[PDB]
Amino acid sequence: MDDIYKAAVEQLTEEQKNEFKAAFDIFVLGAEDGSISTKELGKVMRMLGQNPTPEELQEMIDEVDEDGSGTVDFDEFLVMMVRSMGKSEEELSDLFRMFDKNADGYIDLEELKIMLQATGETITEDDIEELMKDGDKNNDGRIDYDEFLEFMKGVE
């Protein structure tokens, strides 16, 4: 679910990025590290008509904090902004069957490559290497039903 948001970040126009940077620079007025701590984030939410606990708030920072710093910088801020801008499990179950062409209950690399070839787009060994790389999180050569659900989380 994390790389869906980084795809959204990659597709922000320079006009949303220029606007988000202006909002971010106002956000960080007064912070000594020049980043959004719980203090500034709380003020904006106290002022946005909510009221967060000092650890209710650390949770939102720590959800986009790829720094282990308890603060949100501009890149993490963009992730946070698009996260606030999927498909049902019963529907993914039926689509999962279309992948599993030998009906063994798993999708292997060749079945994944047959579907990719069917898309019509030009496919590379790195496309296939990193798609199976994302799906198979126990690297056992198969993506089972549960991995397929997480693999497709949020996919339109």
Binding site: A7, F20, A23, L48, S84, M98, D127, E130, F151
Partner: protein, 104 residues
């Protein structure tokens, strides 16, 4: 990573479209297969008094035959529903736009 997150998102989206497409076609094959089976299993009627009432009794008995067969496969489907429900329980055991306005 070795390709962009936007590319892997494009591929995933296209994968689902064509899987959905394969689902649709599979449903259309099933429709055509069903019509072919029904043309075999329920050949439409082709119409004397005595022969007519022999046919009507043969159809009457056949209704009883089919409904028993249809019940027999419905019973198997029913136990599969309960079994799926038992296996599913075993697996279980194992905002920003108001911010931009207020900031700008």
């Amino acid at each position: 990573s070795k390709i962009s997150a936007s590319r892997k998102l494009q591929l995933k989206t296209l994968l689902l479209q064509i899987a959905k497409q394969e689902l649709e076609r599979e449903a259309e094959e099933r429709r055509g297969e069903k019509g072919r089976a029904l043309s075999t299993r329920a050949q439409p009627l082709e119409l004397g008094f005595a022969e007519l009432q022999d046919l009507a009794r043969q159809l009457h008995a056949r209704v009883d035959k089919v409904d028993e067969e249809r019940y027999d496969i419905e019973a198997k489907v029913t136990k599969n529903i309960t079994e799926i429900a038992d296996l599913t329980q075993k697996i279980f055991d194992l905002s920003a736009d108001a911010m931009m306005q207020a900031l700008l």
